[PDB]
Design a protein around this ligand. Structure first.
Ligand code: HEM
Length: 294
């Protein structure tokens, strides 16, 4: 069928102040619910939820993507690739209850932006206007990437999301956050030490740790260091491919450049598939709780 156009439609009468209140409620709950996942907190799972709800997009026919908020439907929430994201969704449930006017796509993507900023990451400009679409618009399972693959796979996979080498390497830096959980993905361990603070640690660890190719308890191969860190085969592919390797070295040597490129690629990922009218509001830059003295 003919590719649909998804036009951003501002939640009736809402403006920056309304969305800053939603950001604040998410940020305050991130601070309060600090026990989750052995005190990592919900920041990393909210970033992963924003990426997986956006990552289903197909540039060829504009199916999937963040616009429709379709993760709320069983086919997508039960995608094996989304195992564990129910924690991010449950976190956002009281937020949606307090702000019922926000669309599901706007909430999932805003959860990601809030988590990155609250974890001292870069500012991520964010635009409102995603509109909930019906159950039959839910994309099928299998549009999210496999972790047991090589650089050729990663590069080809991300062409579907209209991401180039620099955008892919910058986006993968989010693997500074959280960890792999054996029961969710068949991989186990964190990528680094500060896994609830957004830094360029992922690139420094790729380049500086002594990695060993081992089998985990799920019988899957992963790269492990004596420091207690791990890398997926797709992460390690970033230092196997010479084009990705040059970009990894750039981000490992320039925190500000990584922040600036991640911010652009992450906003692009969250906005793929959406048509913003010429007279839509400009993207919002939310203040963090710290900047507000809250
Ligand atoms: C080649 C592409 C990618 C692959 C194969 C991949 C794979 C995975 C895997 C297997 C996990 C562990 C899931 C679990 O066991 O809990 C994970 C976690 C995570 N992913 Fe990625 N990912 C990719 C790209 C990305 C991107 C583009 C982002 C965001 C920009 C992202 C953000 C995260 C975050 C924050 C976590 C930690 C979640 C948590 O701690 O609960 N990933 N990823």
């Amino acid at each position: 069928t003919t590719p649909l156009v998804h036009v951003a439609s501002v939640e009736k009468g809402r403006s920056y102040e309304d969305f800053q209140k939603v950001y604040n409620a998410i940020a305050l709950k991130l601070r309060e619910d600090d026990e989750y996942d052995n005190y990592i907190g919900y920041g990393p799972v909210l970033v992963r939820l924003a990426w997986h709800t956006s990552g289903t997009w197909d540039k060829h026919d504009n199916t999937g993507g963040s616009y429709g908020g379709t993760y709320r439907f069983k086919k997508e929430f039960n995608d094996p690739s989304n195992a564990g994201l129910q924690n991010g969704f449950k976190f956002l449930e009281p937020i949606h209850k307090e702000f019922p006017w926000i669309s599901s796509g706007d909430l999932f993507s805003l959860g990601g932006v809030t988590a990155v900023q609250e974890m001292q990451g870069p500012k991520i400009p964010w635009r409102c206007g995603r509109v909930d679409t019906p159950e039959d618009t839910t994309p099928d399972n299998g549009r999210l990437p496999d972790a047991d693959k090589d650089a050729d796979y990663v590069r080809t996979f991300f062409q579907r999301l209209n991401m180039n080498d620099r955008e892919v390497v910058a986006l993968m830096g989010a693997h500074a956050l959280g960890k792999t959980h054996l029961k969710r993905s068949g991989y186990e361990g964190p990528w680094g030490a500060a896994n609830n603070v957004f830094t360029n640690e992922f690139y420094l660890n790729l380049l500086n740790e002594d990695w060993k190719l081992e089998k985990n308890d799920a019988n899957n191969e992963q790269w492990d260091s004596k420091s207690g860190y791990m890398m997926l085969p797709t992460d390690y592919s970033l230092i196997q491919d010479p084009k990705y390797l040059s970009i990894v070295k750039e981000y490992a040597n320039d925190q500000d450049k990584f922040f600036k490129d991640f911010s652009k690629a992450f906003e692009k990922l969250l906005e793929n598939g959406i048509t913003f009218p010429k007279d839509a509001p400009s993207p919002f830059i939310f203040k963090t709780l710290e900047e507000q003295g809250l």
